[PDB]
C-alpha cells in the first residue's frame, strides 16, 4: 500500500530500530556477566537446603517406582547397568586428577593452588562402597534381592552441613510397623556417613574434577512380592529433610517391589 521507496525507508527504520535495541541488550548481557563472579553465586536464594538423588532412578508416575523379578534378570539388568555406567566416572582411572584425602574435617581451601589456577578436590572412588561397588557383585545386590541404592546429595558452593558428627543417611519405611520386623539396612561406608572433608564446594571452575560423596544403602530385610515404600532421610544439623513444596530436599522416597 505504501510507496515502494517509502516501504524500504519504513523497513530500514524498523531494521535499524531492532539493531539499536538488540545492541543495548548485547551491552547489557556484556555488563551483566561482568557484574558476577565465576566461583560463587551472588544470591543462591532457592538453594537454602540441598536436594538428594538416588540410583538407580526409575519412575513410573507420581514419583520413584522400582519393581523387578529376581528370577527374571531382564527386569534388573537395566538397573545394574544404570549403576555401572553411573560409577564409570568414579573409577580410579578416570578420577586421577585429585588427592587422596584424610583431612577428616572441613577442607577450606583459602587460596588457589592447583594446575592452571585450579583447586584441589578430594577423591571418592567406587571401591569405598565395598559391596555395592560393582564388585564382587555386578548386579549390586539385585540378583539377591538385597538391592544397593546409592544416595548422593546436591552440591552448593560454600555450604556447610554441620560440625557435630558426619552427615549420615537413615533409610526406613513409613507405614509398615504392624506386621513384620523393622528394616535392616547396611550402609557403605559404615553408619552411612559422608566425610566432612568433602565440603565446601568451590564450584565447577574452581574444582574441575569434583565428585560427590556417596553412600550405598544395601537393603536386606525388605519383603518379597510386597509393595513397600522407603525413605532415606539425611541427618545433619544444617539439613532440612521435610518441606511440603519439595520432597527431594533432604530425603528420597521410592516405592520398592522385589518379586520372586
Amino acid at each position: 500500500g505504501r510507496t515502494l521507496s517509502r516501504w524500504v525507508w519504513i523497513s530500514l527504520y524498523y531494521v535499524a530500530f531492532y539493531v539499536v535495541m538488540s545492541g543495548i541488550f548485547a551491552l547489557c548481557i556484556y555488563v551483566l556477566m561482568r557484574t558476577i563472579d565465576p566461583y560463587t553465586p551472588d544470591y543462591q536464594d532457592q538453594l537454602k537446603s540441598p536436594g538428594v538423588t538416588l540410583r538407580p532412578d526409575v519412575y513410573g508416575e507420581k514419583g520413584l517406582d522400582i519393581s523387578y523379578n529376581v528370577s527374571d534378570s531382564t527386569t534388573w539388568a537395566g538397573l545394574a547397568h544404570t549403576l555401572h555406567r553411573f560409577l564409570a566416572g568414579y573409577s580410579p582411572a578416570a578420577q586421577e586428577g585429585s588427592i587422596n584425602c584424610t583431612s577428616e574435617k572441613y577442607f577450606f581451601q583459602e587460596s588457589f593452588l592447583a594446575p592452571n589456577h585450579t583447586k584441589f578436590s578430594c577423591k571418592f572412588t567406587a571401591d569405598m562402597l565395598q559391596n555395592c561397588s560393582g564388585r564382587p557383585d555386578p548386579t549390586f545386590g539385585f540378583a539377591e534381592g538385597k538391592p544397593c541404592f546409592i544416595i548422593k546429595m546436591n552440591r552448593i558452593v560454600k555450604f556447610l552441613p554441620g560440625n557435630s558428627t558426619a552427615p549420615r543417611v537413615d533409610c526406613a519405611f513409613l507405614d509398615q510397623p504392624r506386621d513384620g520386623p523393622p528394616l535392616q539396612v547396611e550402609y557403605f561406608p559404615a553408619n552411612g556417613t559422608y566425610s566432612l572433608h568433602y565440603f565446601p564446594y568451590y564450584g565447577k571452575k574452581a574444582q574441575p574434577h569434583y565428585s560427590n560423596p556417596l553412600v550405598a544403602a544395601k537393603l536386606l530385610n525388605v519383603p518379597r512380592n510386597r509393595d513397600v515404600v522407603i525413605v532415606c532421610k539425611i541427618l545433619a544439623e544444617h539439613v532440612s529433610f521435610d518441606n511440603p513444596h519439595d520432597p527431594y530436599e533432604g530425603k528420597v522416597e521410592f516405592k520398592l517391589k522385589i518379586q520372586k
Binding site: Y13, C28, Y43, Q44, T53, Y59, N154
Partner: protein, 987 residues
C-alpha cells in the same frame, strides 16, 4: 385498505358498514362484542423481549466473538495437550474460563445499565388513562379511550385528546393539533366535508393521538389501534432496521486487525515450530497459543467502563442513553437531520409581535424568559393590554403557581391561550386583574359577527362609564374603527393610518404568523348608566366607530436554547438539515432564525425576487439556501437529490412525510455521512430508527419517537446535544489513547513465550501471571485515560473522516505493538538473564536448556556454577523469572500510560499530574504489584515471589527510554508538521 374509502362514504354507507348510527351510536351489546373481536383501542407495545434473551444479546460483538473464538481455541488446544500427555493444562482451562468470565461480567453490567435506562425513561411518562366522550344507545357518557371499537360514536371539545381515528359527522368551529403526524404548527380546521381523497389531507378525519384545540365535533371511529394512522406509522418505524453504530464498527475493525496479526504470527511460527523438530500436533499447539496471546483479555471491560463513565456524565445533564455505544455516536456525527415543530420550536402558540404607537414591537418568545421584552411604558400600550386582557375567556387550571407560566395548562381556545399567558407574564395575575373590571356584556367568536366583544364597568367608583373591548381579524376590526390610540392621544383614523395598519398587518403576515387586531370604546355614563340593559340582538350599544388599540401577532417560537445550540453544532462542522412536515413559509422563518439559514443567504426564489428575472434564469450554484417541499422531493431521484444536497449547504425540507424523512436520512447515509436525527412526534420514529443516533425529546416526545430513539433529552434541553458532541469526541480520542495503551503490553507477554519455543530457554513469563497483568494490574490505569481532556479545541474540529480517521490504524497498531512492545520485551529479557545469572544460570546456558529445565526426572541439574538443583527449586527460579519479567512489564507500563495521556502534545506542556485519577491509578498499580510479590504465601497460591529490590531498578532505564522516545516523537511531530514524520510516527 379500510381507511382510504371511509371519509368518502355517505353517512348511510358508514352506518351500514359499521352497523352503527350517526345520532345514537353503537348498542352496548355490539360495542362489547366488537371490543372482544378487535381488541383494545391502543397500540401494541414491543412484545418480544424475553428477560434471558435481553442478556444473551450482550454476549455478542467484535471483542466478544474474538474472545469466544479464543475461549474455544483454548479448549481444543487443551484436548490436544492432554492427548499428548502434556501437564499443567490447568492453565488452558484457567485462561479460557476467564475469557468467558469477563465477557459475561461485562454482559450483565451492560444489562443492568440498559435496564436502568428503561426504568428512568419509563419514570417520566404519564400513566393515567386517557378518556373519551362516547355516545352509545343514545347516551353520552365517558369511558377509557381504549374501550372504543370500530363504528362507535364519539364527541370532542376544546382540550380533549382525539380518542380514535374519527370520521367527522358534524362540527362547529372545530380546530385541532396535528403536530405529531404532520409537522404543522398552525391549528388545522376540521369539517365534515371531504376535502381530499387521501385521508392524510382530508379535513373530515381526526387522528388517533391528536388534541382538539378549539370548537366541538362529533363523528364516527373508522379505525382503532394499530390500524390508525398512528399505528401504521409506528409499525413502519419498527419495520426499519437500525444500522450498526460507528463505535461498534471501529471495534470490529480492530478485531480484524488483531486477528490478522494473530493468525499471521501463529502461522509463521507454526512452520518455524515444525522446522525445529517439533511434532505437528505440538507445532500447532504453539500456533494456537500465539493467536490466543494476541487477544487482549481485559480490553472489553475497559472499553465498557470508559463508555459508562461518559454515560454517567451525560446522564447527569438529564440526557439519558439506552446503550453505551450511543455515547460516542454524537462525536462522529457529520449531519443532523432535525424536525422543526416540538424539537426546535416549543410547539406552543406564543405572542411574538405587537403593533402599537406606530411601531412593531417584538416580545420575548423564550420559556425561561431569557430574551428581551418590549416597551411597556406607553399609554397606548396600557390601553392595548387592557383590551387583550379583558377580552378573553381563557383560564388557568387550578394549582399551577409552582410551574412556569409557559408550562401551565389553560382551559381556552388556541389564540386565547397564548394571549392569557401574555398578560399573565406582562400584567401579572391576569384573571385577578380582569375580575376587577366586571363584565356586563359578552359576544363570543362566531361567523355572523366575525369578532369577539365584551362591555365592562370600570375599576374605581369615581368612573361610572363603561368600556367595550373587541378583538378579531385585523381587517374586520379595522372596518369598525374610527380612531386610533397613538402616542398618548386618540387620533382620527385617516388614510395615512389606514395604509400604515395595512402594511404592518402584511409585514407580520409574511413571517407566517396569526395576527389579531384589538380595539376599545368608552361608553358614556350618560347614554349607558349603571344597570343599563345591553341586548345583543337589537344592537343597543355601538358596534362600529370604535377606537383602534393595536395589532398582536403570535407564532410557534423556537425553544430558548435551540438557536445557539445550532450555532455551536455548525462551528464543529456538523451540517444541519431541517426535515419538517410543516408548510415552507414558517419552515424557512424558523430555519433562518435558529441558524439553519445564515443572515445574507438566499434561495433561487429569493434571488429571482431581487434580480427580477424568472427563477429558472438565476444560477443554482449561486444560491446557498434551498427549500424543498415534499411534492417536489417526490419528483426527484437519488441523482437529482444528491446534487441538490451538495449544491445548497443550508437546506430545508418542508411538507415531508415520515417516509421522506427516512429517505433523506438514507441518502445522506449512503453518501457516507453519520446522520443523527432529532425528533419529537411519531412522524420521526422512522427517521429516528434509521439514523445512526436518534435523539428524542423526553417531554414533547411521543412514545414512538421515544421508543425508536437511542437517546432521550429528559428536560427537553436541546443544548444537551452539543454536550454530546464534545463528550463523544472526547472518549473516542480517549479510546485511541486507552486501547493503544492496553494493546502494547501484549507483545512483551508473547515474545518470552515464542523464544521459550525457539531458543528453548526456561519459561520467562507464565500464563497465570499475564492474567494478573491483563485483568488486574492495568485495568485501573487504562480506564484512567477516560479523563484526559482535549488536546485541541475539540469543538472547533471537523467531524472525523470515517475512512481515514480510525480508532486504530496500521500506523497506530504497528507503532504500538512493534516499537514500544519491543522495548518492553527487551527489558523483560534483560531482567530475565539477570535473575538467571545472579541466581546461577548464564545467558548462553539458558539457550536450549528448557528440556532438562522442565524435566521432573532430573533432580541434580547443574547451573553454570556446577551446583545441583532439584525440580521444585528451578521451578521457583522460573517463578522468579515470572515475577522479574512481570515487574519489568509494569515499570514500562507506568511509563506507557504517561506516553498515552497525549498523542500530539508534550507531557511538559500539559503536565504530568493534570489527570488526578491517572496518578491515583498508578499508585494503585505499584502497590498491588508489591502485594503480589511480598505477601506471605504468594509463591504457592499464584506464581509470584518476593524479588530482591535489585531487579526492580533494572527496567527503569527502559521505561525512561520510552518516555524519551515518544516525547521526541511528539516534539518532532508538533514542531515539524511535515508529512514524513507525521504519518509514519503518529496515532
Amino acid at each position: 385498505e379500510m381507511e382510504i374509502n371511509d371519509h368518502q362514504l355517505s353517512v348511510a354507507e358508514l352506518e351500514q358498514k359499521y352497523q352503527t348510527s350517526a345520532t345514537k351510536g353503537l348498542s352496548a351489546s355490539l360495542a362489547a362484542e366488537l371490543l372482544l373481536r378487535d381488541g383494545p383501542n391502543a397500540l401494541r407495545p414491543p412484545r418480544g423481549t424475553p428477560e434471558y434473551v435481553k442478556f444473551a444479546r450482550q454476549l455478542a460483538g467484535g471483542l466478544q466473538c474474538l474472545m469466544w473464538v479464543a475461549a474455544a481455541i483454548c479448549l481444543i488446544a487443551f484436548a490436544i495437550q492432554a492427548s499428548e500427555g502434556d501437564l499443567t493444562t490447568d492453565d488452558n482451562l484457567y485462561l479460557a474460563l476467564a475469557l468467558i468470565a469477563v465477557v459475561v461480567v461485562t454482559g450483565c453490567f451492560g444489562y443492568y445499565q440498559e435496564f436502568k435506562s428503561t426504568n428512568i425513561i419509563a419514570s417520566f411518562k404519564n400513566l393515567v388513562p386517557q378518556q373519551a366522550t362516547v355516545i352509545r344507545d343514545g347516551d353520552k357518557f365517558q369511558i377509557n379511550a381504549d374501550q372504543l371499537v370500530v363504528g362507535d360514536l364519539v364527541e370532542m371539545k376544546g382540550g380533549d385528546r382525539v380518542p380514535a381515528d374519527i370520521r367527522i359527522l358534524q362540527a362547529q368551529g372545530c380546530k385541532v393539533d396535528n403536530s405529531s403526524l404532520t409537522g404543522e404548527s398552525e391549528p388545522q380546521t376540521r369539517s365534515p366535508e371531504c376535502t381530499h381523497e387521501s385521508p392524510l389531507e382530508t379535513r373530515n378525519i381526526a387522528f388517533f393521538s391528536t388534541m382538539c384545540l378549539e370548537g366541538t365535533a362529533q363523528g364516527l371511529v373508522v379505525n382503532t389501534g394499530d390500524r390508525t394512522i398512528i399505528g401504521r406509522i409506528a409499525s413502519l418505524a419498527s419495520g426499519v432496521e437500525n444500522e450498526k453504530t460507528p463505535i461498534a464498527i471501529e471495534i470490529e475493525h480492530f478485531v480484524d486487525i488483531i486477528a490478522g496479526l494473530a493468525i499471521l504470527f501463529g502461522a509463521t511460527f507454526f512452520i518455524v515450530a515444525m522446522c525445529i523438530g517439533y511434532t505437528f500436533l505440538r507445532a500447532m499447539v504453539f500456533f494456537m497459543a500465539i493467536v490466543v496471546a494476541y487477544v487482549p483479555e481485559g480490553l472489553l471491560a475497559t472499553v465498557t467502563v470508559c463508555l459508562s463513565l461518559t454515560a454517567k456524565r451525560l446522564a447527569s445533564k438529564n440526557c439519558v442513553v439506552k446503550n453505551l455505544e450511543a455515547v460516542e455516536t454524537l462525536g462522529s456525527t457529520s449531519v443532523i437531520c432535525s424536525d422543526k415543530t416540538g424539537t426546535l420550536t416549543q410547539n406552543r402558540m406564543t405572542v411574538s409581535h405587537l403593533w402599537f404607537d406606530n411601531h412593531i414591537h417584538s416580545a420575548d418568545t423564550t420559556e425561561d424568559q431569557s430574551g428581551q421584552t418590549f416597551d411597556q411604558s406607553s399609554e397606548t400600550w396600557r390601553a392595548l393590554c387592557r383590551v387583550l386582557t379583558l377580552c378573553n375567556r381563557a383560564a388557568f387550571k387550578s394549582g399551577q403557581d409552582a410551574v412556569p407560566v409557559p408550562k401551565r395548562i389553560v382551559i381556552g381556545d388556541a389564540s386565547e391561550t397564548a394571549l392569557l399567558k401574555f398578560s399573565e407574564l406582562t400584567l401579572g395575575n391576569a384573571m385577578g386583574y380582569r375580575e376587577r373590571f366586571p363584565k356586563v356584556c359578552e359576544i363570543p367568536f362566531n361567523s355572523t359577527n366575525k369578532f369577539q366583544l365584551s362591555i365592562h364597568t370600570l375599576e374605581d367608583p369615581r368612573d361610572p362609564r363603561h368600556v367595550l373591548v373587541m378583538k378579531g381579524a385585523p381587517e374586520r376590526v379595522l372596518e369598525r374603527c374610527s380612531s386610533i390610540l397613538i402616542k398618548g392621544q386618540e387620533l382620527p383614523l385617516d388614510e395615512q393610518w389606514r395604509e400604515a395598519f395595512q402594511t404592518a398587518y402584511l409585514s407580520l403576515g409574511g413571517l407566517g404568523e396569526r395576527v389579531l387586531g384589538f380595539c376599545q370604546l368608552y361608553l358614556s355614563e350618560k347614554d349607558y348608566p349603571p344597570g343599563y340593559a345591553f341586548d345583543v340582538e337589537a344592537m343597543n350599544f355601538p358596534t362600529s366607530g370604535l377606537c383602534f388599540a393595536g395589532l398582536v401577532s403570535m407564532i410557534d417560537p423556537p425553544r430558548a436554547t435551540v438557536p445557539d445550540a445550532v450555532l455551536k453544532c455548525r462551528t464543529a462542522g456538523i451540517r444541519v438539515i431541517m426535515v419538517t412536515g410543516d408548510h415552507p413559509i414558517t419552515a424557512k422563518a424558523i430555519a433562518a432564525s435558529v441558524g439553519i439559514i445564515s443572515e445574507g443567504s438566499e434561495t433561487v426564489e429569493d434571488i429571482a425576487a431581487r434580480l427580477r428575472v424568472p427563477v429558472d434564469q438565476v444560477n443554482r450554484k449561486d444560491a446557498r439556501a434551498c427549500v424543498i417541499n415534499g411534492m417536489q422531493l417526490k419528483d426527484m431521484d437519488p441523482s437529482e437529490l444528491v446534487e441538490a444536497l451538495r449544491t445548497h449547504p443550508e437546506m430545508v425540507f418542508a411538507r415531508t412525510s415520515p417516509q421522506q424523512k427516512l429517505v433523506i436520512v438514507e441518502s445522506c447515509q449512503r453518501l457516507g455521512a453519520i446522520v443523527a436525527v432529532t425528533g419529537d412526534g411519531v412522524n420521526d420514529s422512522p427517521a429516528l430508527k434509521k439514523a445512526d443516533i436518534g435523539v428524542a425529546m423526553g417531554i414533547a416526545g411521543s412514545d414512538a419517537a421515544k421508543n425508536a430513539a437511542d437517546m432521550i433529552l429528559l428536560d427537553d434541553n436541546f443544548a444537551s446535544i452539543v454536550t454530546g458532541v464534545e463528550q463523544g469526541r472526547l472518549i473516542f480520542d480517549n479510546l485511541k489513547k486507552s486501547i493503544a495503551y492496553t494493546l502494547t503490553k501484549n507483545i512483551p507477554e508473547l515474545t518470552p513465550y515464542l523464544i521459550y519455543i525457539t531458543v528453548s530457554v526456561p519459561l520467562p513469563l507464565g500464563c497465570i501471571t499475564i492474567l494478573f497483568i491483563e485483568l488486574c494490574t492495568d485495568i485501573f490505569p487504562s480506564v484512567s485515560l477516560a479523563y484526559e481532556k482535549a488536546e485541541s479545541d475539540i469543538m472547533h474540529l471537523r467531524p472525523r473522516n470515517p475512512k481515514r480517521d480510525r480508532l486504530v490504524n496500521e500506523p497506530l497498531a504497528a507503532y504500538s505493538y512493534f516499537q514500544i512492545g519491543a522495548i518492553q520485551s527487551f527489558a523483560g529479557f534483560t531482567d530475565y538473564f539477570t535473575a538467571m545469572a545472579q541466581e546461577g544460570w548464564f545467558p548462553l546456558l539458558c539457550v536450549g536448556l528448557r528440556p532438562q529445565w522442565e524435566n521432573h526426572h532430573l533432580q541434580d541439574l547443574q547451573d553454570s556454577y556446577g551446583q545441583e538443583w532439584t525440580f521444585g527449586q528451578r521451578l521457583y527460579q522460573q517463578y522468579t523469572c515470572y515475577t522479574v519479567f512481570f515487574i519489568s512489564i509494569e515499570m514500562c507500563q507506568i511509563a506507557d500510560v504517561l506516553i498515552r495521556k497525549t498523542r500530539r502534545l508534550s507531557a511538559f506542556q500539559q503536565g504530568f499530574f493534570r489527570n488526578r485519577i491517572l496518578v491515583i491509578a498508578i499508585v494503585f498499580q505499584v502497590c498491588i504489584g508489591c502485594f503480589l510479590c511480598y505477601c506471605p504465601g504468594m509463591p504457592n497460591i499464584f506464581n509470584f515471589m518476593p524479588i530482591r529490590f535489585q531487579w526492580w531498578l533494572v527496567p527503569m532505564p527502559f521505561s525512561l527510554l520510552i518516555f524519551v522516545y515518544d516525547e521526541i516523537r511528539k516534539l518532532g511531530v508538533r514542531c515539524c508538521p511535515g508529512s514524513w514524520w507525521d504519518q509514519e510516527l503518529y496515532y
